[PDB]
Amino acid sequence: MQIFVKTLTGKTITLEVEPSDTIENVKAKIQDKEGIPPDQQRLIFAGKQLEDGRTLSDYNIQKESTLHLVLRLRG
Amino acid sequence: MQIFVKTLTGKTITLEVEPSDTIENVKAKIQDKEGIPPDQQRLIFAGCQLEDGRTLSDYNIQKESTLHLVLRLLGSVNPTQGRAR
Amino acid sequence: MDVFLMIRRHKTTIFTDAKESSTVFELKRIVEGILKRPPDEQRLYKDDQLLDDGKTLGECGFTSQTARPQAPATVGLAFRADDTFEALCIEPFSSPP
Amino acid sequence: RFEVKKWNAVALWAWDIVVDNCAICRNHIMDLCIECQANECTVAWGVCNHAFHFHCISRWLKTRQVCPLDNREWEFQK
Amino acid sequence: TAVFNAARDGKLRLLTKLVSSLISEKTNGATPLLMAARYGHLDMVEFLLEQCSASIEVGGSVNFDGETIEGAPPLWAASAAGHLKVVQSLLNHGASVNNTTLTNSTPLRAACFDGHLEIVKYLVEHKADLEVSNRHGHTCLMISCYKGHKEIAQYLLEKGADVNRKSVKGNTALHDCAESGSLDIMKMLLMYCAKMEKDGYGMTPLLSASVTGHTNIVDFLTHHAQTSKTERINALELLGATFVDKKRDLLGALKYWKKAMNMRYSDRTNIISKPVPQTLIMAYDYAKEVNSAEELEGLIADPDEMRMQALLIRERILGPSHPDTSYYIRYRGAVYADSGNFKRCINLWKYALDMQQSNLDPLSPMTASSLLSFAELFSFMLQDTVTFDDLMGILCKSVLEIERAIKQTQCPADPLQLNKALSIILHLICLLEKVPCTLEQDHFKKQTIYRFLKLHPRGKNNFSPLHLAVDKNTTCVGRYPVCKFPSLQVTAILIECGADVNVRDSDDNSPLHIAALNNHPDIMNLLIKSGAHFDATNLHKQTASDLLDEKEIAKNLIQPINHTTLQCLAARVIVNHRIYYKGHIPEKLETFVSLHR
Amino acid sequence: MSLKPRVVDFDETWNKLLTTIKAVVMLEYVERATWNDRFSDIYALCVAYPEPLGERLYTETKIFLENHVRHLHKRVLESEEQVLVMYHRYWEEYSKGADYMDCLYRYLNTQFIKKNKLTEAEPLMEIGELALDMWRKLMVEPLQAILIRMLLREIKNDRGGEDPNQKVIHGVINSFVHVEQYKKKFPLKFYQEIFESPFLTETGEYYKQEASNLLQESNCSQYMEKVLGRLKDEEIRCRKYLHPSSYTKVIHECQQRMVADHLQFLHAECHNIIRQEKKNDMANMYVLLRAVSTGLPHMIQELQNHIHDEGLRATSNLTQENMPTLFVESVLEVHGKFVQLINTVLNGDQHFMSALDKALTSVVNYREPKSVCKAPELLAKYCDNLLKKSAKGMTENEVEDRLTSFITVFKYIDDKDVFQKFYARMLAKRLIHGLSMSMDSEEAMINKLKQACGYEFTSKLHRMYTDMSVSADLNNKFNNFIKNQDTVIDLGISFQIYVLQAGAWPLTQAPSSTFAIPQELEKSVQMFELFYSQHFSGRKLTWLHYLCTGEVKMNYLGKPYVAMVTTYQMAVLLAFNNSETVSYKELQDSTQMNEKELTKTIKSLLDVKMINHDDAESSFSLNMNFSSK
Amino acid sequence: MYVKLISSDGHEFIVKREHALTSGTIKAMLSGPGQNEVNFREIPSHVLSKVCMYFTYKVRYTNSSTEIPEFPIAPEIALELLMAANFLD
Amino acid sequence: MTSSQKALMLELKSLQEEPVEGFRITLVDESDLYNWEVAIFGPPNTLYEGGYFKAHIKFPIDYPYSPPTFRFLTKMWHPNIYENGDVCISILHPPVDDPQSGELPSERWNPTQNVRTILLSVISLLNEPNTFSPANVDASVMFRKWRDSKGKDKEYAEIIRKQVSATKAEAEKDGVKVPTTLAEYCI
Ligand SMILES: [Zn+2]
Ligand SMILES: [Zn+2]
Ligand SMILES: [Zn+2]
């Protein structure tokens, strides 16, 4: 697969890890791509925050989606 | 079952408070322990105050919590008080 | 300084001022301007001093503590006619009840 | 056979890291600061792969130290 | 007897030893016997009684519960203090057992006020009356049953006292019990043949118990029968409204309103409609009572609808007679004002003030306190919008209150009460003057202030409104920049409106005299070049210039020659040398020389 | 006799006073012995010991004034056709008499009259005010219509030169304003109503008739001066007949009638006039139409259309073959001519400069149905032609004036972005090869552009300028590194390098040909790279093979030659260095590039035939048979 | 530039015009049938003498002196002087 | 002409493009660039099918250094909002420490936060709140009750349905389809 995750900078960089990876793998990959620690970054798909303990097969994103990462926060 | 209290002196005081309690009961416990005036004592947990008359169980207070008692047109009216009495 | 004076002959009274202490010739000239009379035909009597008409008023006694505007001072006057002068006839005011 | 006497040429240069934009003051790296634009200052660097601004990073250094993306530390050297 | 009343002064070594001219040595409204019996000085009391018992019933002044009380007999004070020993010492010595105070207060009443049971039984076992009430007719049973005190109540009841004792306001002991819970005394009184009666405003005791906020007696009266459906329905709605207003609980209000509406609907045969007015109230946001069970669910999301519903229920059930309704309306308005929103507070307070004036006597502290709230609100809102209509309306209501008060037939209103109204009016005029307007509204303001001035009002020390406009004691109201009287602007508006410039106070002090006593030469100049008199004389032989300080005469802001004529000097000489002038000079000149005395 | 109060008879005293007041009201003669004697008689009356007689004095004075006013009105109405000639005669006496007799009753005015109604708003009044009220009664209940009619008839003598009595009509009209004693709030209501209503109505009717008469037998050219003369005479007529406060209304009504009744007639001729010059005829119409509320937009639209048409005719047709200078010259000429016309004849109105700007914007950004807006290309061509100046034909000072003028045209193009890229590219090509007109002029360029458009427009040019300014200093201060390189230096090629930025210079084409490097160029490149890295680090220096031009100095032929040539043919000559004959295969394998460029270089070499051919394996050779300068 | 005032017993007082124009009644005179002798048939000499002195005092000490001494006025002429000052201003 | 206005105008003309779900920059007059107005479309699978929640954002004088404020005009029932449309986003707190959360793990304001990331954070909190620190205790209590009940009690569902129905009526009236197709939502 191949997913072009939107980054904080206004220039998305694609990722092509594998279609059924884990959010841990995704966070590690974007970490080594940009430098943001996994304990600091947080991923959003379409409004639903994605937990770090699941797998990507449970979200059914096909092969051309987009995830927008944000810094971790709580209310 | 036991939670601490961060006073103005920094000493941690262990209070045995059950979820079936209230802010009034907690204030009574701290008055028994030290004797702070109710007109001056305040309750701040996680940056926001605790409403009087609201049970701490509904306020989501768990074990080993931490509370602070930092000191703290308008309603310049009083109820009518004219009787014999 | 500014003294205030009353010049009276018979039933007449003229109110006038003076600068500090000037020549009596100037006062006679003012009187002439009021009445159209020659300055060499006047005597300008004080009470009994006759006021020699060549000097200043300072040595004449008129000071700023004697001629206040709230109560002026008086100076007599008597024209000397072709025959002779008068007998200094000044009439007094009426007596109030 | 042939030979040569003088040779003239030109060359282009760019920093070999990301050639990215400042994430603090939100402008291209090779551009003046907004406070500087209100009217010569250089551009700083970090121990990370991130390259930050100079005046922006100083202004935030007056408050904290670490990378605004990585709350670890700051170097300022190179 | 210097230190004897200054201190407790037991001093058995010396004070015991010292004709007995100090038999009734009393001063400053206090007597030695009162202090002897006040602090349990048994030896001092014995010595005083043995020296002379003629002043046994002499009463003086004392401050037990903070405030000072005059005409307190020693027995009354001793009963309240709980000092039993002095009590039966005086009883054995032969003191009168029914020596009432200046307010018809019995020592038995003072005994049951604090809860001294032993003194109560000792007093009532010595031929003491029970049906003696105060000036307002509040019996000792009502006071005893107000507090808990559920041990002396039974004993006093067994002593054979009455229970139906309507006072001037017609309040029974059941009302006093219902105001403070006490279900045990409820049960006892209900057992001993008690009746269920209304009061002056038409309140059933259950309604009063629902008003005060208690939740147990309302359940008891929901049981026990002798009540129709309407009474229980009204009690439950009032309880919900009081929960919303006094406290801030809302889920309980939901539960109470839900059970009340379920009971109201009940069966199809017996369906009770909701009595509603045909009018819509502006300040209530044109809301209405939800006469549907479906509309009740989901109401917790929007609190404002609940505040309107509670206000409407309280207004309908009780009526404008009570002060509680107006107080709660103003409280909700003040809460919204503190919430940062200022548009609805003005409307709510306007409706509250309109309700207040059309229900209650003129010049009362409630309607007086209503006006300073508006004054502070407009002062804050001006301070770093404002409409002309609101300020004009509130000024009109203030002037209407002043007119209604001054048109009283007997006219007993003290100037102390009128001073607050006059100061509020002047502050309102200043706040109005700090706002731009149009032509027709300007003319309306001029006409209204014309009517107010021609009403001829009076104040403290017989002061005209113009007098208050040029005094530094008027600005006691508020603390913000309300122009800090005296002011050029307010005086100018009053003068151009037609305020008389030569009126006199109780000391014959013209406005110029007050201004001079408060310095401010500009106001003096403005008054002088408006028709005032420079050479006026007060009660003493003092003019306006002789009251001036050093700064005014040094700066020379007042030139006397410009406003002095030869008539003034002649009149002054005539007055000072006491020359006979009547029958020798014109009449107007006689009035003039009488003025220049 | 004393000022003490006493019993007064009021029978001899009033008979004594009646003679004096009668002689004073009529402006007769009263001696100073009795005028002062009549004083203190009023004082004795006012301080009569029992029951003073102030009210009786007031009543009898009022009755006397009533009788006098009625007698005067009787006389005036009795005389016929001499009205308005005796009204003035009996008003001049009465006003001064009332003013004088007010002074007599000073005691009664000061005391017993001061107790009137205060400023709360007929019961009581002062005496001069009472006399004026009595004259108002004379003027309202008896004659008003005859006076108004005769005044209007006298004023109606406008077309004729018949001059009425100026000192009479003015006095009569100004007499109405004298209600000043009761002028607390409204001092001009009486005059306003009574005179201002029928005078305005009559003026409107008369000027409608006059406008119709004038328009019946006249053109639209000999009409503006006639109406302007009528309006100019109106003001001087109104000065000597009416009150100071009633000029604007009369002039406005007259303008409204004559102009606003026929604004549709004037519009056809305003269309006609603008097309031709008619310099004098525009000012009259502008002055006339500045008064009417809505008449100006039609003239503004016509002027805009005329300017647009003239500019299109001047610019589009005069195209020559290909010149960008006539474009700017023609636009400047049109702008200057019409700016001068507007400033000299329309009194600098701001509403028409906007029309000029709109029309010039439309004419400067015209686009063909099948072509793009070719303004910015010609603007940039004018720019570099005005700035190269490597050859004679201009000066060093007129250029700045040309540029200052040019910024005006530059301020009109809608799409400045394509201009920015075009100027960037062409300034780059001008700057690298060093053919600019010395220096201190491109700075004027950049400063003017920054002042005109802004900073973000000129951001990508100032840094290019600074790069070019600092490259020379870097070379001068760095060439000593060879001397201070410890070991000897064997670089036999003269060097002058330029260090360029990355995004500043818009020639960032990605390379696709890996051309080989000459022999000594390898050592030179190594030395420069190491020295530059030592001077500063953190930058990769790319190499461009399509702008580096050197030169070859050859002396093998009879005439030595110097060839200023780019690196391709130097590489070709170095390949030819080893052997006199070099085939196409080894030409191809000596470097690595697209064969099109190699073929182009070979063809250019053969164009002057410095080499000869004896494709895929064609064998070329050195050509000693070619000579040049 | 002078006016002449005649008392009720014969004495004539000449006072400057600006000083004499203080009273409103004198301003009411001298403005009428013409534009210089004013005859009062009521004012005695001992009051008209003091009136001119008051005129001089008022004109001279108008708005200049910091301290103004009191005006001497005997109590034997007060009743007549009040009426005289009322008739004038 | 100040750094705040420069940053906001840059962000606006960058935001002229098309974000994913929450993007409606309404009529800002550009006389005061600090005051904004944004609309939230709503997630396609959470409790807010096809809503339209108008909001308001106030930008302080020091935008890159100080956090902004977020307010909701239409009233909803959210366990992490106040009564007057306020929100309790941790990012909008000034950098200072009295115990609230870990300062280092990006639980406060940093200059590398923009309007985009602020918006996505708001949507994420709207989708998933916390019960550790209630902002209103009634919504917190019913949140906990429904979460444990797993759909047994639907009072929260009913009130949310009523509110989204009202806001959907307003949206359909004004100008916008309010997409909920799981395909038109993505940009
Ligand atoms: Zn920056
Ligand atoms: Zn900088
Ligand atoms: Zn970093």
Residue numbers in the entry:
A (entry chain U): 1 to 75
B (entry chain E): 1 to 72, 692 to 704
C (entry chain G): 1 to 97
D (entry chain K): 21 to 59, 67 to 105
E (entry chain H): 5 to 22, 31 to 396, 405 to 617
F (entry chain A): 1 to 121, 134 to 626, 633 to 647
G (entry chain D): 17 to 51, 58 to 111
H (entry chain C): 6 to 192
Text from the published report:
As the transition state for poly-ubiquitylation is fleeting, a ligation mimic was used to join acceptor ubiquitin fused to a C-terminal degron peptide substrate (Sil1) with donor ubiquitin and eventual cross-linking to the UBE2R2 active site. The structure resolved to 3.8 Å resolution and enabled rationalization of poly-ubiquitylation on the millisecond time scale. For example, (1) the amino-terminal side of CUL2 binds the substrate receptor complex, while its C-terminal side interacts with the RBX1 subunit harboring the RING domain that recruits E2s45; (2) the UBE2R2 catalytic UBC domain and C-terminal extension both participate in forming the closed conformation for the UBE2R2~ubiquitin conjugate; and (3) the acceptor ubiquitin and the UBE2R2 UBC domain interact. Interestingly, NEDD8 is not visible in the cryo-EM map. Second, these differences occur concomitantly with the organization of the distinctive Cdc34/UBE2R-family E2 insertion (His98–Arg113), forming a loop that is the heart of the complex. The structure confirms the importance of His98, with its imidazole ring residing directly across from Cys93, the key active site residue that becomes thioesterified to donor ubiquitin. Rather, the loop residues unify the E2, E3 and the ubiquitins to be adjoined into a cohesive functional unit (inset). Multiple interactions between the UBE2R2 synergy loop and RBX1 facilitate shaping the loop’s conformation, which in turn forms interfaces with both the donor and acceptor ubiquitins. A unique E2–E3 interface is formed between the synergy loop and the RBX1 RING domain, stabilized by Glu108 in UBE2R2 and Arg91 in RBX1. In addition to contacts between UBE2R2 and the acceptor ubiquitin, CRL substrates are anchored by high-affinity interactions between their degrons and cognate receptors; here, the C terminus of the Sil1 peptide and FEM1C.
